[PDB]
């Protein structure tokens, strides 16, 4: 269940260890696409397997003529969607630049289907996505508790909590508005909202006598786009749905070009890559400070750069990491024969090394998100009666 | 085997005495040509043997005609090579000025043979002298230990250790570069490196809430030369090997004039003698400070000026010295019969004289460089790998 260098642990000692590590100067959590399935999300391999069956005709071209997908991974559903989209975008640009009508019209069809597939599972509410106060729903009962536990555990006169994520949905932002706190995502403005990297160095205070957290998105969001002005903008959910989401989902053929920013596409341009570079640099800088604690869950360890930066950061003897991996049993069985994928080697190797600050969890299903939020320390509804008073007069 | 004040001493008391001497204000060491024997070097006797073996026809011109070497010293292999080189670099200049062709032509061959024989014994690695990361090998395992030991015994606010040597090889630089320590040797610049005598008075500090030492070379180095500019330049090993070392080692007759600075040859020019003068003056200035402790290892006590300077410094009541000498017994036996050489007489006179400031260690194989490093103390809280595993994991991570 719980391993650290080769020994077991119980529930109480693990809780005490978690509480001890939640007191250092800097605390940050890294989240992946696996933590969004508990509220209506889908796994990437689910998207791939639902895509190849829906468009069997297109799957032949991706493998036979352009050599963009390996057949073995397609059988094993080991295809990375982000890299596929990023590499497919530049083919269309090259075809347009060289004026090849056949290749251009062929490529204009695959991207529409791919974007329809990827954006279908990111709504999390269906048609009701364009409504108000979505954070009051049942599915977001855990996110509010996690945010409240993270904020309330910080001592006075200390740094603000840091949150990292990879999913490009609004699930983690819906709870913030209903809770009543302020999240600085690097943007500022209402009528014409723009991007300012210096926004990450601000803090509130009371002139006559506190709620703020920092969020980074390493792969963008659904509300970010570049409207031909060579500048980045942000809009609301209703505005985005009225602008382009509805047409993409409903219409069969609707593609425009290098206009949307998700899930990490159009990196070739020198204007869009700025955001990704800034976010990655800020992520790298954070884990290089002394007295830091890092929590990882729902990450498949498939990103080579993240693994490399994590491994290289362990040379500091004051660096702590907590990692969850529900599929450690199949990993250890696979590595016993000296075989497996790169992710298998990455996850297994991090156990047979000599360092007492590295924690690995392989409890099969013990490493789920609702249990992870439960493990956080907590202290040991008054507006519930005014509803009747409001209903009295209407 | 261990004498101080004319009385024997055991191992534990000696080890406790050595530790107490490392807490003084000033600490310095002095090394000789014997300290590099375990890394692949040679002593002066081996050099003279090889020279008089490989070039037997040239000994006649040196002994019978120009009266540069005596037969008795030649037989016993007790010839001062650097003094011979210095004295030979003068006949050539006189002959060149006076316009005597045959004398000018003979000394070119003589000096070419001498340099070819003396240069080959200092590379320490052979053809891999021009490669990189030479400090990661296992032959330099004890120099790093010595450097780490001397640095970690200094409390904050105290001075930095100083190292003196009479070698002209790159062992200490290679050892120090691997550890991540910066040595000051009075040179600055990269594309044009020059000699500034005032650089010996600088130290580092941090402004973000570092570690260094000093190195004095009393006889020069292989990477120092002067090229028609009336100034001294320093280059890396690769440039020296590609410029003149390869020609020196692998050519029949190839000699140039006042170009090389080692082992103290061209002292008749006021531009070159400045470096030697400053290097020797700082040594004499160092040992005149109160509360000073000095270790000696690998020095043959064949020099007059160093002996005179060391003897004079004992008049102060706060100067302590520790000496190592493998051949104490033979020197004691030879002198008691009325014979012996100058070094043996000097060391016996030092041993006999009654002082608590002088310690002499002699045991044969117990007075070597490897044993000397062991006596200095490890701090208890010094940590001791995982870094190799991390580097291998990173390298294998595609």
């Amino acid at each position: 269940s719980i391993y650290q260098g080769g020994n077991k642990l119980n529930e109480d000692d693990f809780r005490s260890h978690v509480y001890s590590l939640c007191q250092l100067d800097n605390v940050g959590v890294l989240l992946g696409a696996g933590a969004s399935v508990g509220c209506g999300g889908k796994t990437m391999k689910d998207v791939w397997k639902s895509f190849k069956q829906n468009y069997p005709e297109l799957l032949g071209a991706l493998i036979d003529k352009y050599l963009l997908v390996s057949q073995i991974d397609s059988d094993n559903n080991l295809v990375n969607v982000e890299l596929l989209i990023d590499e497919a975008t530049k083919f269309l640009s090259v075809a347009k630049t060289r004026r090849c009508e056949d290749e251009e019209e062929e490529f204009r069809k695959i991207l529409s289907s791919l974007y329809k597939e990827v954006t279908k599972a990111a709504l999390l509410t269906g048609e009701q996505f364009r409504e108000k106060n979505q954070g009051k729903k049942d599915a977001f009962k855990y996110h509010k508790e996690l945010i409240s536990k993270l904020i309330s555990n910080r001592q006075p006169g200390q740094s603000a909590p840091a949150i990292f994520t990879t999913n490009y949905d609004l699930a983690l932002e819906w709870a913030a508005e209903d809770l009543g706190i302020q999240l600085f995502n690097g943007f500022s403005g209402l009528h014409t909202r723009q991007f300012y990297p210096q926004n990450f160095d601000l803090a509130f205070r009371n002139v006559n006598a506190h709620y703020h957290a920092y969020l980074y998105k390493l792969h963008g969001s659904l509300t970010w786009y570049q409207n031909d002005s060579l500048t980045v903008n942000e809009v609301s959910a209703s505005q985005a749905y009225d602008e382009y989401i509805n047409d993409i989902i409903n219409k069969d053929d609707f593609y425009r070009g290098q206009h949307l920013i998700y899930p990490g596409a159009n990196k070739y341009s020198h204007t869009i890559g700025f955001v990704y570079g800034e976010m990655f640099r800020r992520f790298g800088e954070f884990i290089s400070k002394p007295q830091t604690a890092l929590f990882i869950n729902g990450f498949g360890f498939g990103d080579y750069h993240i693994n490399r930066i994590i491994l290289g950061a362990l040379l500091n003897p004051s660096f702590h990491v907590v990692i969850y991996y529900p599929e450690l049993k199949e990993a250890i069985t696979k590595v016993s024969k000296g075989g497996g994928s790169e992710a298998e080697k990455a996850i297994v190797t991090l156990k047979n090394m000599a360092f007492n600050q590295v924690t690995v969890v392989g409890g099969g299903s013990k490493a789920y998100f609702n249990s992870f939020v439960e493990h956080l320390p907590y202290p040991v509804n008054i507006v519930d009666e005014l509803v009747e008073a409001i209903a009295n007069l209407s | 085997s261990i004498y101080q004040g004319g009385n024997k001493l055991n191992e534990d008391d000696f080890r406790s005495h050595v530790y107490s001497l490392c807490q003084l204000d000033n600490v310095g060491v002095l090394l000789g040509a014997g300290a590099s024997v375990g890394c692949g070097g040679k002593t002066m006797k081996d050099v003279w043997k090889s020279f008089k073996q490989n070039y037997p026809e040239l000994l006649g011109a040196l002994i019978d005609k120009y009266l540069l070497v005596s037969q008795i010293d030649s037989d016993n292999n007790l010839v001062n090579v650097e003094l011979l080189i210095d004295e030979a670099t003068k006949f050539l200049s006189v002959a060149k000025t006076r316009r005597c062709e045959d004398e000018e032509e003979e000394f070119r061959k003589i000096l070419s043979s001498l340099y070819k024989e003396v240069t080959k014994a200092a590379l320490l690695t052979g053809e891999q002298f021009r490669e990189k990361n030479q400090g990661k090998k296992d032959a330099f395992k004890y120099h790093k230990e010595l450097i780490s030991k001397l640095i970690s015994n200094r409390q904050p606010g105290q001075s930095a250790p100083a190292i003196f040597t009479t070698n002209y090889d790159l062992a200490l630089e290679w050892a120090a570069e691997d550890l991540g320590i910066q040595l000051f040797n009075g040179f600055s610049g990269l594309h044009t490196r020059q000699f500034y005598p005032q650089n010996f008075d600088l130290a580092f500090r941090n402004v973000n809430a570092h570690y260094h030492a000093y190195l004095y070379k009393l006889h020069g180095s292989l990477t120092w030369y002067q090229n028609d500019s009336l100034t001294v330049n320093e280059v890396s090993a690769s440039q020296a090997y590609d410029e003149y070392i390869n020609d020196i080692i692998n050519k029949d007759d190839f000699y140039r004039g006042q170009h090389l600075i080692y082992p103290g040859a061209n002292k008749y020019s006021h531009t070159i003698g400045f470096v030697y003068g400053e290097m020797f003056r700082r040594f004499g200035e160092f040992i005149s400070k109160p509360q000073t402790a000095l270790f000696i290892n690998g020095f043959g006590f064949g020099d007059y000026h160093i002996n005179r300077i060391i003897l004079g410094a004992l008049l102060n009541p706060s100067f302590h010295v520790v000496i190592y000498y493998p051949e104490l017994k033979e020197a004691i036996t030879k002198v008691s019969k009325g014979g012996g050489s100058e070094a043996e007489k000097a060391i016996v006179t030092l041993k006999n004289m009654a002082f608590n400031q002088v310690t002499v260690v002699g045991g044969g194989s117990k007075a070597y460089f490897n044993s000397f490093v062991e006596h200095l103390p490890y701090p208890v809280l010094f940590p001791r790998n995982i870094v190799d595993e991390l580097v291998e994991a990173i390298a294998n991570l595609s």
Binding site: - | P377, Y378, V380
Partner: protein, 102 residues
């Protein structure tokens, strides 16, 4: 103190630490070193238990002082009196079957 390549333990109640000495917490390695016995009688010991504070240190005991002198056990009812006797007898039998216990 530090030895040539290892460490030994000697205690005399007349040496005291100097003033201004820094204070540090103790790791389990130093705890292991403190209870270490002479290198001559290492394989002549019997395991006893593990401390409750760290639960990572092994406590041994040489046979010489284990059984040369006499002994007595004091405690309340059922608190490791008969259990300890049975366990110690079993261990000394396992280490040396030649032993006799009545």
């Amino acid at each position: 103190k530090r030895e040539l390549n290892g460490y030994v333990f000697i205690s005399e109640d007349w040496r005291l630490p100097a003033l201004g000495s820094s204070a540090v917490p103790l790791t389990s390695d130093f705890l292991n070193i403190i209870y270490s016995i002479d290198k001559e009688e290492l394989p002549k010991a019997v395991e006893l238990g593990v401390d409750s504070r760290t639960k990572t240190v092994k406590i041994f005991a040489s046979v010489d002082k284990l059984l040369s002198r006499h002994l007595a056990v004091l405690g309340s009812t059922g608190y490791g009196k008969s259990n300890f006797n049975a366990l110690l007898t079993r261990k000394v039998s396992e280490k040396y079957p030649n032993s006799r216990i009545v």
